[PDB]
């Protein structure tokens, strides 16, 4: 009796301040609204900037025209 749990710095270590205990209904409503697709767009454009320099005849892979 009177013993079993302690470690009152944080207590039991079952939660490392992971954000499930406290957050805010404004930053979490805009941080997920756009960021992952913008990081994708930046990483993709920075690769495509090396590939556009090889030509590949890119415009002939579309060739928008009426030719029946």
Curated annotation (Swiss-Prot):
It is found in: Cell membrane. Residues 1-37 form the HAMP domain. It comes from the Archaea. Transduces signals from the phototaxis receptor sensory rhodopsin II (SR-II) to the flagellar motor. Responds to light changes through the variation of the level of methylation. Also acts as a chemotransducer. Belongs to the methyl-accepting chemotaxis (MCP) protein family. This is Sensory rhodopsin II transducer.
């Amino acid at each position: 009796m009177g013993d079993g749990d302690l470690d009152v710095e944080l207590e039991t270590r079952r939660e490392d301040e992971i954000g499930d205990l406290y957050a805010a209904f404004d930053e979490m409503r805009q941080s997920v609204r756009t960021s992952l697709e913008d990081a994708k767009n930046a990483r993709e454009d920075a690769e495509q900037a090396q590939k556009r320099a090889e030509e590949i005849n890119t415009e002939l892979l579309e060739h928008h025209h009426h030719h029946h």
